[PDB]
Swiss-Prot record, chain A:
Residue ranges crossing the lipid bilayer per the database entry: none
Pfam families in the cross-refs: Tsi3
Organism: Pseudomonas aeruginosa (strain ATCC 15692 / DSM 22644 / CIP 104116 / JCM 14847 / LMG 12228 / 1C / PRS 101 / PAO1)
Functional summary from the UniProt entry: Immunity protein that plays a role in preventing early activation of toxin Tse3. Occupies Tse3 substrate binding site and prevents the substrate from entering.
Name of the featured protein: Immune protein Tsi3
Binding site for Ca(2+): E105
InterPro entries named among the record's database cross-references: Toxin-Sub_Inhibitor_sf (IPR053762), Tsi3 (IPR054004)
Calcium is among the record's keywords: yes
Ranges for region Disordered: 32-64
Calcium keyword on record: yes
Alphabetical keyword list: Calcium, Lipoprotein, Metal-binding, Palmitate, Signal
GO molecular function: metal ion binding
Swiss-Prot record, chain B:
Organism, scientific name: Pseudomonas aeruginosa (strain ATCC 15692 / DSM 22644 / CIP 104116 / JCM 14847 / LMG 12228 / 1C / PRS 101 / PAO1)
Pfam families: T6SS_Tse3_cat (PF22115), T6SS_Tse3_N (PF22120)
Main location (coarse class): host cell
An annotated Gene Ontology molecular function: metal ion binding
Enzyme Commission number(s): 3.2.1.17
Keyword flag Transport: no
Activity regulation statement: Enzymatic activity depends on membrane binding.
Cofactors required: Ca(2+)
Signal peptide coordinates: none
Claim: Secreted is one of the keywords in the record: yes
Self-association and partners: Forms a heterotetramer with Tsi3 consisting of two Tse3 dimers and two Tsi3 dimers. Formation of the complex inactivates Tse3 enzymatic activity.
Keywords of the record: Calcium, Host membrane, Hydrolase, Membrane, Metal-binding, Secreted
Recorded superkingdom: Bacteria
Protein encoded by which gene: tse3
UniProt-recorded name of the protein: Peptidoglycan muramidase Tse3
Length: 124, 399
């Protein structure tokens, strides 16, 4: 896992843009698309969301805090099924949410980059 | 007769409960395959009570396969009689054909699969023998999978037990070893001359199918090219389009990846991998019943998940599944609202949804590029593969 320059959103969101990824200012944060012309590129979205996440979500510890996530799988193609991570982290009063997708032939991916990107995301 | 006399005398050359000599069995098989009146021969063996004897005395399962497949395939009016004799013979020898590569097919299923396969081959027009092809010797790197090589994924050695656990544990080196070999799709194409590309295409397409059921065919197994043409007519596609889709997959495939694809699918974990020539995903083949045109419903209702994964490693089944699925992705495209696929329209400005409903002879090239994207990835969700469209388009241009 690796990042370079930091990106700041008018809505008070601070994060680093992952190396090898193109970035785009989004409505409530940033979208990162893996660079090059890959067969099966990773897509990443990080956002401030003022509304809370739902219950029922199996959680995990994200450093000095707790994260709530869900992984969903759809049919994809040749490169494997589509896997979609949805993970949210408490930040002050609101929350920061990360979204990632990736195809896999070999079961659920770890989503390491997405988790790194969430954990190191700023509430200010 | 005129082959039953021969066969009748040959089986008198053994004990009642013991199996005939390997070479005698080979001679029975050959006689069966070389015979001009196969139904009559069956009817004859049955009159004399020699038909069941034949199944009892032959042989080890490797030779039982050849015998069963040969009879099931060449046979027609009298097929049911061969089917019935085999059934009574399995009372004694239960294991029959169900071992090795074929352990996921009960012996009666092996028979029915050979029957259905031979019938489809004559009917769809791919029964006829293919010339020996020059296969690649490669064992590593891009284009070293069954597409290039002829080596059935099912024949590859077991991945070392320890390495299997490293795979489950996501060990980077091990996962790299058993993964897609290409990152920069363009750089790979750049290093190939037009002659190199054409060579890969002929190697891919000119080889005999690597089939789990060789003796279901009247003579030798057909060229892959012939099977592709046949699937093309069946699905209103083009052998060039099927060829390009598969060439692309096979470029981004290795021998080691063939081993993981098949072994992980039939392992305790029944992984949901993509297998064989067109890299069909196991669950997709089940979901959309991709074998519909080669196997009748009776056989299809009975196939285990692991039998399906095994069939996908048989070239003719894989080619037909791949074609069925391409035609499915095209019909599904036909019915979209291009307005709701802005990124698709954006990436492929000459896309023509209506043309997808028809033959690819009249598809704009952007239709091939788009479908390539939506073959490697989920179809028509407006998320595109950035590199695959150009990759498949290069293969298509070669064809
Ligand atoms: Ca592959
Ligand atoms: Ca695969
Ligand atoms: Ca897609």
């Amino acid at each position: 896992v690796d990042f370079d320059k930091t990106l700041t959103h008018p809505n008070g969101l601070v994060v680093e843009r992952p190396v090898g990824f193109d970035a785009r200012r989004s409505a409530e944060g940033f979208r990162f698309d893996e660079g090059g012309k890959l067969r099966n590129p990773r897509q990443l979205e990080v956002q401030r969301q003022d509304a809370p996440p739902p219950p029922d979500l199996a959680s995990r510890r994200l450093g000095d805090g707790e994260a709530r996530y869900k992984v969903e799988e759809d049919d994809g193609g040749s490169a494997g099924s589509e896997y979609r991570l949805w993970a949210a982290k408490p930040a002050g009063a609101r929350w920061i949410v990360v979204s990632a997708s990736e195809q896999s032939e070999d079961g659920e991916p770890t989503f390491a980059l997405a988790w790194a990107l969430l954990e190191r995301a700023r509430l200010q | 007769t005129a082959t039953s006399d021969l066969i009748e005398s040959l089986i008198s050359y053994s004990w009642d409960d013991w199996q005939v000599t390997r070479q005698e069995a080979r001679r029975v098989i050959a006689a069966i395959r070389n015979d001009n009146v196969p139904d009559a021969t069956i009817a004859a063996l049955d009159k004399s009570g020699s038909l069941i004897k034949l199944f009892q005395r032959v042989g080890p399962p490797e030779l039982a396969r050849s015998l069963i497949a040969s009879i099931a395939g060449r046979t027609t009016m009298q097929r049911y009689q061969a089917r019935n004799a085999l059934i009574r013979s399995l009372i004694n020898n239960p294991l029959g054909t169900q071992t090795d590569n074929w352990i996921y097919f009960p012996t009666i299923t092996f028979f029915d699969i050979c029957a259905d396969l031979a019938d489809a081959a004559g009917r769809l027009g791919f029964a006829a023998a293919g010339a020996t092809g020059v296969a690649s010797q490669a064992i590593q790197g891009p284009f070293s999978g069954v597409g290039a090589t002829g080596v059935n994924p099912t024949d590859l050695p077991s991945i070392a037990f320890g390495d299997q656990l490293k795979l489950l544990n996501k060990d980077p080196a091990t996962v790299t070893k058993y993964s897609n070999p290409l990152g920069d799709l363009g750089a790979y194409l750049s290093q190939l001359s037009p002659q190199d590309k054409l060579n890969q295409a002929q190697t891919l397409v000119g080889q005999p199918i690597s089939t789990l059921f060789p003796d279901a065919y009247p003579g030798n197994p057909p060229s892959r090219a012939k099977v592709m043409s046949a699937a093309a007519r069946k699905y209103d596609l083009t052998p060039q389009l099927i060829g390009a889709i598969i060439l692309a997959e096979q470029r981004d495939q290795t021998r080691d990846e063939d081993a993981k694809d098949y072994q992980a699918a039939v392992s305790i974990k029944s992984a949901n991998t993509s297998i064989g020539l067109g890299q069909v995903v196991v669950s997709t083949a089940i979901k959309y019943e991709l074998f519909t045109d080669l196997l009748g419903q009776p056989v299809r209702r009975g196939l285990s998940r692991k039998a399906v994964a095994t069939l996908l490693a048989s070239d003719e089944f894989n080619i037909f599944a791949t074609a069925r699925y391409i035609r499915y992705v095209a019909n599904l495209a036909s019915q979209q609202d291009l307005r709701k696929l802005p990124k698709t329209r954006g990436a492929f400005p000459s896309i023509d949804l209506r043309a997808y409903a028809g033959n690819p002879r009249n598809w704009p090239r952007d239709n091939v590029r788009a479908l390539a994207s939506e073959y490697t990835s989920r179809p028509w969700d407006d998320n595109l593969s950035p590199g695959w469209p150009m990759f498949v388009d290069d293969a298509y241009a070669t064809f």
